[PDB]
């Protein structure tokens, strides 16, 4: 098994590399609509926190 693994490990970790890059650039485009909604909730929640800190 250790002799077979080293024969088939560098062509495996290129398929996994390109599959990771493709899943990363899919997850970023699936996240990017939710990000602009998330920033506008963390802008009211920080203005309501500076009202407490100044009061």
Partner 1 sequence: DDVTVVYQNGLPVISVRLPSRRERCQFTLKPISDSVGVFLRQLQEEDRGIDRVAIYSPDGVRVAASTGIDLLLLDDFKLVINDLTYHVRPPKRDLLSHENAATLNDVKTLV
In which element (H, E) is residue 28 found? Answer: helix 12-39
- Tell which phi-psi region holds residue 18, choosing left (phi > 0), alpha (psi between -120 and 50) or beta: alpha
Q: Does 30 bind partner 1 (CB under 8 A)?
A: no
Q: Which of 12, 21, 28, 49 binds partner 1 (CB under 8 A)?
A: 21
In which element (H, E) is residue 33 found? Answer: helix 12-39
Q: Does 6 bind partner 1 (CB under 8 A)?
A: yes
Judged by CB, which is closer to partner 1: 14, or 34? 14
Site residues for partner 1 per CB under 8 A:
3-4, 6-7, 10-11, 14-15, 17-18, 21
């Amino acid at each position: 098994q250790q002799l077979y693994t080293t024969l088939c490990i560098e062509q495996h970790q290129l398929n996994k590399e390109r599959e990771l890059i493709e899943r990363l650039e899919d997850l970023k485009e699936q996240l990017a609509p939710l990000e602009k909604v998330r920033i506008e909730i963390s802008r009211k929640a920080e203005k309501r926190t500076t009202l407490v800190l100044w009061g």
